[PDB]
């Protein structure tokens, strides 16, 4: 436990932490410049090396963190996250993982404590509401089944499939185009379709308000 104390004083360093945060902001700026095709045509090599650099440094960092923290590291969600977001980035382009790499910019939430407080407030609120979520999901499922067989033969895009009915009922819940776009069309064939979707909007768009209030009191009380 001689060298172990040496890398512990490096890992626990105020410089080390600040150095990591400096790269995250740098890489975040860089990942937004990779958006410009103009910029990329002239600096893709400069950037792709910088991308391969920052990921090695982030890999060294994780390995150090593991030696210093041992099994306590995997008890930490913020570290588990940091782990999975460099592992994703470690797998080569051989093609959607190339896009998930930008999730590493969320380390700026992990690495910055002022941010963790907010996320953790929000995430801890959720298990209390897990029961209302299962009510609405059961409610969606019961109605998604009904709508599939109530309107999916004549309206396949919106209701031809359980998942399609799930998606459309979600859209109705957000109220987006629910009447002009969906229910008025359905009423040219099924004049009583409003007996299905008006009760659905009452229940769901009012249960949601409770789910809203509940979540947004627990977080208020915690902080």
Ligand X SMILES: CCCCCCCCCCCCCC(=O)OC[C@H](COP(=O)(O)OCC[N+](C)(C)C)OC(=O)CCCCCCCCCCCCC
Q: What is d(CA 189, CA 212) in angstroms, rounded to the nearest whole number?
A: 36
Contact pick of 97, 105, 122, 214 for ligand X (by CB under 6 A): 105
Contact pick of 48, 56, 131, 137 for its own copies (by CB under 8 A): 131
Residues making up the chain, counted from first to last? 223
- The stretch near its own copies (CB under 8 A) out of 14-22, 49-57, 76-84, 134-142 is 134-142
Contact pick of 60, 170, 189, 199 for its own copies (by CB under 8 A): 170
> Degrees (nearest 5) of the Cα angle 147, 149, 152?
80
174 marked among binding-site residues: yes
Token reading at 18: 């600040």
By the rule CB under 6 A, 166 interacts with ligand X: yes
By the rule CB under 8 A, 103 interacts with its own copies: yes
Residues of span 133-162 touching ligand X by CB under 6 A: 133-134, 136-138, 140-141, 150, 161-162
Q: What is d(CA 47, CA 40) in angstroms, rounded to the nearest whole number?
A: 8
By the rule CB under 6 A, 91 interacts with ligand X: no
Contact pick of 8, 17, 21, 28 for ligand X (by CB under 6 A): 28
By the rule CB under 8 A, 78 interacts with its own copies: no
- DSSP secondary structure string, 156-199? HHHHSSHHHHHHHHHHHHTTTTIIIIIIHHHHTT-TTTHHHHHH
Contact pick of 66, 141, 200, 221 for its own copies (by CB under 8 A): 141
* Contact present, 219 and 121 (Cβ < 8 Å): yes
Q: What is d(CA 116, CA 99) in angstroms, rounded to the nearest whole number?
A: 24
CA 67 to chain centre: 29
- The residues binding ligand X (CB under 6 A) are 24-25, 28-29, 32-33, 35-39, 96, 105, 108, 133-134, 136-138, 140-141, 150, 161-164, 166-167, 170, 187, 190-196, 198-199
């Amino acid at each position: 436990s001689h060298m172990y104390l040496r890398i512990t004083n490096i890992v626990e360093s105020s410089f080390f932490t600040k150095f990591i945060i400096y790269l995250i902001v740098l890489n975040g700026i860089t990942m937004g410049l990779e958006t410009s095709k103009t910029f990329m045509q002239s600096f893709g090599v400069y950037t792709t090396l910088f991308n391969q650099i920052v990921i090695t440094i982030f890999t060294i960092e994780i390995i150090l963190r593991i030696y210093v923290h041992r099994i306590s590291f995997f008890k930490d969600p913020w570290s588990l996250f940091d782990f999975f977001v460099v592992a994703i980035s470690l797998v080569p382009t051989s093609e959607i993982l190339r896009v998930l790499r930008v999730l590493r910019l969320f380390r700026l939430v992990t690495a910055v404590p002022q941010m963790r407080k907010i996320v953790s407030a929000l995430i801890s609120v959720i298990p209390g509401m897990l029961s209302v979520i299962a009510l609405m999901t059961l409610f969606f499922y019961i109605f998604a089944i009904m709508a599939t067989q109530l309107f999916g033969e004549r309206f396949p895009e919106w209701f031809g499939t359980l998942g399609e009915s799930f998606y459309t009922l979600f859209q109705v819940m957000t109220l987006e185009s629910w009447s002009m776009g969906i229910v008025r069309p359905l009423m040219e064939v099924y004049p009583y379709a409003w007996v299905f979707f008006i009760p659905f909007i009452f229940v769901v768009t009012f249960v949601m308000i409770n789910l809203v209030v509940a979540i947004c009191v627990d977080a208020m009380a915690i902080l």
